[PDB]
Design a protein around this ligand. Structure first.
Ligand SMILES: C=CC[N+](C)(C)c1ccc(CCC(=O)CCc2ccc([N+](C)(C)CC=C)cc2)cc1
Ligand SMILES: C=CC[N+](C)(C)c1ccc(CCC(=O)CCc2ccc([N+](C)(C)CC=C)cc2)cc1
Lengths: 540, 540
């Protein structure tokens, strides 16, 4: 037997597993507890560290997926099923994974910590696309991933109460970061160069940790992929959070028979309801029909987030911080088949002029009629105001800019001008195995497979140029984790990647072609969302 | 005893003069009185037809210019002085001029009636650039131009009173049009094919004759160069017209401090003041400092204009009408040196960001701060937000589109979509003799010298290809006056000039190169001024 798979951490001992990759073996430790299971009376409560265990915990397989909604829009379709849970759902789900090279590094190694996304209602570290055996084997780095509570189990907030304080799903991530500081050295990891990187709701969560003092001291670099904490979907006010939690309780029968309005009795009822009863009513508490809007998201409670994320970025000092931000080519196209009128993944979605006018009401919810008119003008080609193919591509840009691209460009612009060294990219490659239709372009979440070196898997049908492109993207992400710069540093033939400056606004395009530097992260479109639109609704 | 230079009309007898052109001789009749001199008691009143005269009226030289402000911004400068009066000022100015070919055409010939511009405060038919000896000799047409009262003498309005009804300057043009009907046949003209073309405020007057039923029966085709009746500067309501008229009186000493407020005794005072006293206080009645805004302009009284010009365009039927509209490449550049901050004729006019923000409030007067912010959002290059050269061209486009280009696009779109045949052009050539600086480009009013064949003058130093370019535009303009279609009737080799329609939006570019068809008359920019900005002002 091998002795590399037996590790002693502060809790106890673990037995790992040796996984095969085309280029070598990797040591994996899957299912490591970092918190007591938040079930029964611990539901909705902040996590507490795992009690030390006697004996050896079997860390040779993925643990359970946190309880969450399961996508049933297109059953049996690879594009949607690839993000659904691949393990049993359970409230017992606070387990983390560690990947380390073989043989174990003798010298301390940088640590990458992956925080998956999923609109704060879904996601798991067990997904095959999030497998980090190829990233660890190729770049010889320590990769850590964890499960955090999602949906109502992680973000239901009755603000001002001890039983449902909210943001407990983000506190799961912080506790998993504290576990890295205390235990990553046992796997050959360097706790003095931790690099947080997430995507979608995970990229927003990484931004939430930058704005929180207790979480700031647990990492040193950040990568945000298609997400930011200042997005319109990432947070919610305490008033709305109280209303959404109250309606969800009323939907499940709480409080019983017009009982007293204490928050103590309300949460007491929600702890007795089966886990699936809460999940079956997650989407019924949304205020209106919309896309890219979620029921239970992080709340500005004053504890974790002192102020709104928009305010904390404006007054924050970010010296000694390296940030890598980016977006895919067509961010908003993925969310249109989830409720926007006239859109289907099985045809071409050649929407009419009237459907485009209604898609803005769903894509940009809770805005005045005049505010919707400004959005219509800015995205309507008035030479062809009724071209179906142009209206379809235009509505994709409306959802993409409003939710992902423009909140990211403002974050990168404010980070660079306040001490941080920011690098920006734009993912422009469409994988040859993409099951989604052609008009979707480069949809949300489909750069993750290339970052995690999935094309290196022999069973997958990626092409030869995509495999080389996968190693190059891993090099960029790993180089940023070690030295804080995506460059080699010396190649010296590869075009350099210039940092994103608030004035020049430089970024690169990532595809099969070499690095091409561009200027402006959709400056003309985002100037409307970040500058003019706030004044439009502020002046009633 | 030359029979060609003696003509008997309804009023009496006229002796003309034979003028020289490099091609051939032309018979000109300059100074025909078509109305009684509006002096003394006839000041501010509609014109009366000229009494028949016993004898022979001398029509061998241009008559006096209507009293008007004289530009003293850049004295002794060819650019501004070429638009200043070349004859002595007098209220006795209602005279017209007729150019006819030599020998006189034995068959009826189409007539081209020319209306000068000048912001309704200046202008004259005696100007050298308005000489129609080359257009008549080369294309064998009949050119007629008149003098209409400008400034307060032609547009001061006290609505509700019979002493100062307003729009009297417009009636001077209609009376000259009735003179054409009764007398143009004596010069060889065809009152059945009368084409009415103007420029700037003259093009605005042409469009206002289209919306006046009595003036509708005096012409059959219309051309509007860099002007529209629906522009924000072309009309003023009755309420503001009474304010500007009464405020102008208070400056000249009327009413006699202090008589009653009835208009009868107020106009009685304004008729006693010398004409120059009325001109010296013309600009002192403007409510706000602004460019491309003029004191006394046509008023919506109900007699001449039943409703606002925009409302009349939306409801009128224009079947059987052929219209030629167009703008120059750089409309707003001429007006920037007339008050906009940081702009000078003698330097590069590299304005700062603060000067740009201040110039928008001058170019777009009397709009909300939120409305001004919307204007800054459109015309700012947010990738280079402080570039002085780009900010200069930006402010030149704001004034150009808001006042000229977009009001023309609204007319041409609603004319074609309601039965009228519309052709559109964009003049892009900058004359080699242009005394204005280079950053102005192709300024306002500098296509007129090419339409009138002035480059064919041997005393002027126009280039060889510019002379040929002048003969092209005269052919385009003459063919439209004869056939109703600009492109040559029998020439399949010359590129075709397609009609402008609401959906296609097709125009041509006029320069040294052959016709090049384009799509969209500033469609993206004009969508903001025509569609969105009205809604932004409705909710204040
Ligand atoms: C049809 C009815 C269903 N009903 C209930 C109405 C329904 C259900 C869900 C939604 C919102 C769906 C999203 O907003 C996608 C959110 C999302 C974000 C990221 C990810 N990755 C994990 C990153 C993978 C991205 C591909 C996945 C999903 C609308 C309606
Ligand atoms: C320094 C003070 C001057 N003050 C009194 C303040 C002053 C005076 C005049 C103006 C308005 C000037 C214009 O809006 C140009 C109007 C115009 C338009 C067209 C033409 N063409 C005849 C077509 C020729 C164009 C080239 C001529 C003039 C503002 C301020």
């Amino acid at each position: 037997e091998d002795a590399e798979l037996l590790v002693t951490v502060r809790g106890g001992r673990l037995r790992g597993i040796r996984l095969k990759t085309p280029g070598g073996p990797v040591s994996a430790f899957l299912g490591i507890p970092f918190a007591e299971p938040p079930m029964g009376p611990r539901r909705f409560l902040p996590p507490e560290p795992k009690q030390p265990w006697s004996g050896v915990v079997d860390a040779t397989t993925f643990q359970s997926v946190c309880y969450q909604y399961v996508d049933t829009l297109y059953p049996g379709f690879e594009g949607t099923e690839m993000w659904n849970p691949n393990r049993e759902l359970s409230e017992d789900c606070l387990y983390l994974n560690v990947w380390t090279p073989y043989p174990r590094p003798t010298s301390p190694t940088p640590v990458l910590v992956w925080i998956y996304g999923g609109g704060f209602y879904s996601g798991a570290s067990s997904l095959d696309v999030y497998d980090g055996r190829f990233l660890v084997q190729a770049e010889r780095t320590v990769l850590v991933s964890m499960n955090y509570r999602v949906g109502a189990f992680g973000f239901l907030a009755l603000p001002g109460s001890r039983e449902a304080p909210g943001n407990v799903g983000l506190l799961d991530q912080r506790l998993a970061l504290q576990w890295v500081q205390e235990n990553v050295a046992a796997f050959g990891g360097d706790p003095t160069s931790v690099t947080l990187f997430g995507e979608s709701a995970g990229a927003a969560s990484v931004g939430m940790h930058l704005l929180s003092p207790p979480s700031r001291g647990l990492f040193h670099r950040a990568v945000l992929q298609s997400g930011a904490p200042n997005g319109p979907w990432a947070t919610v006010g305490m008033g709305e959070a109280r209303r959404r939690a109250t309606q969800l309780a009323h939907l499940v029968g709480c409080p019983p028979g017009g009982t007293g309005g204490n928050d103590t009795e309300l949460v007491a009822c929600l702890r007795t309801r089966p886990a699936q009863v809460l999940v079956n009513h997650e989407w019924h508490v949304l205020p209106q029909e919309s896309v890219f809007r979620f029921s239970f998201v992080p709340v500005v409670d004053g504890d974790f987030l002192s102020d709104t994320p928009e305010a904390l970025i404006n007054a924050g000092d970010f010296h000694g911080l390296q940030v890598l931000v980016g977006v895919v080519k067509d961010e908003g196209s993925y969310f249109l088949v989830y409720g926007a009128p006239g859109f289907s993944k099985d045809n071409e979605s050649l929407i009419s002029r009237a459907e485009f006018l209604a898609g803005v009401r769903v894509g940009v919810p809770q805005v005045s009629d005049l505010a919707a008119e400004a959005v219509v003008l800015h995205y309507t080609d008035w030479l062809h105001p009724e071209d179906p193919a142009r209206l379809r591509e235009a509505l994709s840009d409306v959802v993409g800019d409003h939710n992902v691209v423009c909140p990211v460009a403002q974050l990168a612009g404010r980070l660079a001008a306040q001490g941080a060294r920011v690098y920006a990219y734009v993912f422009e490659h469409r994988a040859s195995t993409l099951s989604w239709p052609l008009w979707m372009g480069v949809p949300h979440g489909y750069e993750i497979e290339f970052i995690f070196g999935i094309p290196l898997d022999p069973s997958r049908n990626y092409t030869a140029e995509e495999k080389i492109f996968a190693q190059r993207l891993m090099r960029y992400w790993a180089n940023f984790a070690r030295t804080g710069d995506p460059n080699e540093p010396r190649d010296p033939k590869a075009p350099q990647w210039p940092p994103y400056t608030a004035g020049a606004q430089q970024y690169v395009s990532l595809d099969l072609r070499p690095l091409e530097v561009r200027r402006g992260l959709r400056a003309q479109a985002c100037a409307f969302w970040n500058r003019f639109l706030p004044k439009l609704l502020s002046a009633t």
